Amino acid sequence: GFTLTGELQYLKQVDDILRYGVRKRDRTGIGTLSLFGMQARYNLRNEFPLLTTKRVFWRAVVEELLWFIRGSTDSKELAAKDIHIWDIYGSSKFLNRNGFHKRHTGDLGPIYGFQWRHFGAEYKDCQSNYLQQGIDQLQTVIDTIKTNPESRRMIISSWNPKDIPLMVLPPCHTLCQFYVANGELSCQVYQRSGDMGLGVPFNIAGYALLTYIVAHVTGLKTGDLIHTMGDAHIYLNHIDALKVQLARSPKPFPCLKIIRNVTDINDFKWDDFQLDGYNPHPPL
Amino acid sequence: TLTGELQYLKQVDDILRYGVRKRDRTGIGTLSLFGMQARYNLRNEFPLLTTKRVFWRAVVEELLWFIRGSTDSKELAAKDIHIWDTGDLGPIYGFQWRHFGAEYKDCQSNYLQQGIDQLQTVIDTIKTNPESRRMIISSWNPKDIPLMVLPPCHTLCQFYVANGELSCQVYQRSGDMGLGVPFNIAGYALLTYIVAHVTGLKTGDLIHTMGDAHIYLNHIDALKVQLARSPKPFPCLKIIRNVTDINDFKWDDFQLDGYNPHP
Numbered sequence: 001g002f003t004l005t006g007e008l009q010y011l012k013q014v015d016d017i018l019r020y021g022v023r024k025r026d027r028t029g030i031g032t033l034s035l036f037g038m039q040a041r042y043n044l045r046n047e048f049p050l051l052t053t054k055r056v057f058w059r060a061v062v063e064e065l066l067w068f069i070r071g072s073t074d075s076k077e078l079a080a081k082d083i084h085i086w087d088i089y090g091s092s093k094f095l096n097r098n099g100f101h102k103r104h105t106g107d108l109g110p111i112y113g114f115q116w117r118h119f120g121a122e123y124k125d126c127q128s129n130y131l132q133q134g135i136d137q138l139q140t141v142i143d144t145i146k147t148n149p150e151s152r153r154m155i156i157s158s159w160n161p162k163d164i165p166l167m168v169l170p171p172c173h174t175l176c177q178f179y180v181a182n183g184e185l186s187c188q189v190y191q192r193s194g195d196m197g198l199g200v201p202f203n204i205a206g207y208a209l210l211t212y213i214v215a216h217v218t219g220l221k222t223g224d225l226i227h228t229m230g231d232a233h234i235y236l237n238h239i240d241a242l243k244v245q246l247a248r249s250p251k252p253f254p255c256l257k258i259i260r261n262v263t264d265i266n267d268f269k270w271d272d273f274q275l276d277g278y279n280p281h282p283p284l
Numbered sequence: 285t286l287t288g289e290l291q292y293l294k295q296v297d298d299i300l301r302y303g304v305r306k307r308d309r310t311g312i313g314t315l316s317l318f319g320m321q322a323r324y325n326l327r328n329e330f331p332l333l334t335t336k337r338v339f340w341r342a343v344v345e346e347l348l349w350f351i352r353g354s355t356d357s358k359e360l361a362a363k364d365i366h367i368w369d370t371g372d373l374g375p376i377y378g379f380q381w382r383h384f385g386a387e388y389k390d391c392q393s394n395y396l397q398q399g400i401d402q403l404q405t406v407i408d409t410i411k412t413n414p415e416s417r418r419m420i421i422s423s424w425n426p427k428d429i430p431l432m433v434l435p436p437c438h439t440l441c442q443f444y445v446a447n448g449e450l451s452c453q454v455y456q457r458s459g460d461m462g463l464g465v466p467f468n469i470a471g472y473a474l475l476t477y478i479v480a481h482v483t484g485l486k487t488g489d490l491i492h493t494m495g496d497a498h499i500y501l502n503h504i505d506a507l508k509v510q511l512a513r514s515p516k517p518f519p520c521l522k523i524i525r526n527v528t529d530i531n532d533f534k535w536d537d538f539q540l541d542g543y544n545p546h547p
């Protein structure tokens with residue numbers, strides 16, 4: 001291979017946004033450097049693509065995925081586990097200032113988890129029960145992988161325009177596609193908007209984890225994660241930090257082991273995962 | 285740092301040299317690679333492949349068929365274009381582009397003001413919030429998919445403005461390099477030209493992303509021939525009339541110059 005992969009390509013990406021990126025006025029008010037249309041390959045064979053040049057909150061990644069898997073959209077459940085990444089959007093101050101004054105605290109609307117397990121259902125609130133409503137994208141993929149893995153139609157999309165106005169924020173990782181070859185599960189994720197500073201390393205971990213999880217329950221080996229994105233951007237108030245992180249040579253990716261033989265997609269716990277060798281670089 | 289049609293050709297070559305044995309949905313064998321991407325420049329050129337003649341008139345008429353939200357294949361046959369061959373194809377691209385989330389009945393029923401007009405929405409957003417990262421047209425509707433004759437290959441696309449130029453990245457889940465992909469490239473390259481013209485913007489890049497990029501085992505020889513050929517300079521597409529309405533485009537409004545494909 002003469003083309004970069006893994007954390008080298010990620011760093012290759014932030015570098016290009018730093019030299020060729022375009023300054024644009026962002027929704028949040030603060031400016032960003034932007035490039036459009038990127039793609040990075042992350043090998044999943046015998047290693048886990050958890051970025052090492054700066055520490056990734058691994059436990060939040062795990063809990064958020066299981067939070068997606070159970071169809072949940074109540075940020076309080078994450079905060080009940082000291083995972084406060086969605087707390088801002090669940091907070092009462094945000095909900096009222098953004099037209100969601102009738103919704104109760106934590107109600108994130110029809111976010112990822114809802115679209116994953118019940119796409120098409122009419123959303124009520126994060127407390128409601130929606131079982132056997134909508135379309136279970138996650139479970140149809142698992143069924144298709146077991147029945148007809150040659151399929152090129154194994155996709156999970158969160159982009160529901162009809163439900164989007166109810167969402168606190170449009171799905172950044174809009175969809176992913178699974179792919180099976182040589183009894184080896186692969187997964188490409190399309191990310192419409194990717195903040196290189198915060199979200200992108202967090203998402204890469206999640207969809208790598210998701211591929212590991214699905215490949216687990218389907219008896220398949222993990223192939224590759226392909227991280228495709230649209231508006232690849234770097235917030236201007238992060239440039240100084242990203243250039244310091246840029247000089248760090250990334251360490252060997254860690255191992256991921258599942259200590260239990262989970263057969264049910266909903267039956268995964270935080271205590272099921274073993275991460276060996278994660279020795280990221282010291283903070284700023 | 286590989287430009288133009290050579291991007292497509294290297295992709296073809298890679299799936300032949302590095303491609304994986306994977307079975308097609310119909311039973312035939314294919315060579316496959318998961319995850320690819322190509323950047324086609326739209327500045328003073330149009331990425332219509334030259335190493336093989338592409339059905340230019342169906343690219344245009346199908347798009348204008350998508351734009352007016354038609355799911356009737358008889359509408360394309362009425363212009364001697366039968367690439368979709370009574371009539372009712374189910375809630376395909378046209379119904380998803382203009383009426384996403386509406387209740388589909390048949391190809392003759394009316395869906396105006398029903399569902400969500402993604403196409404006009406991204407148009408409005410370009411004139412209003414060109415810095416938006418949410419300008420997306422998705423054709424993937426798990427609800428309506430079992431009623432489609434064929435699931436959408438081009439799942440979605442995202443538009444992007446920078447320095448007055450309009451760029452589009454399209455996600456194609458499944459790419460037959462032998463036939464589909466070339467027709468598809470020009471399909472979304474043409475789309476960018478249309479939305480740019482309406483919005484008054486320039487044309488940036490078509491970013492072409494693929495999932496299962498594959499080659500059928502019949503087409504190997506016929507692609508080994510095409511790869512032997514030398515690429516030729518891309519044509520120049522000119523929108524000859526000043527159209528303001530996305531629905532006001534006709535075949536006569538397009539002038540394709542300098543297209544010299546191989547036999």
Ligand SMILES: O=c1[nH]c(=O)n([C@H]2C[C@H](O)[C@@H](COP(=O)(O)O)O2)cc1/C=C/Br
Pocket residue numbers: 152153309434435436437438458459460461463464465468
């Ligand atoms: O636009 C296209 N481009 C393409 O390559 N193809 C090709 C891609 C693939 O071989 C086949 C689609 O079958 P599945 O992937 O669903 O099993 O047709 C098809 C289309 C039309 C889609 Br409607």
